Amino acid sequence: SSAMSAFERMEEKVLMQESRAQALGELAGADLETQFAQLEGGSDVDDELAALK
């Protein structure tokens, strides 16, 4: 459909745009271990969560 083919197109456009936006940082990065630390805080955050909880 016309109004439904416009919607799906812009939707896929949105998806690709967000993927690129995340890719720029995903492409860059201070260091692979820095990337992983950014992904996951590490033992520090787990210990803090356990202690406060």
């Binding site: 745009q17 940082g25 860059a28």
Partner: peptide
Amino acid sequence: ARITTAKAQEQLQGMV
């Protein structure tokens, strides 16, 4: 809203 975030977001990122 997602689009509006992204549009400026890609002009502003980490300073590698």
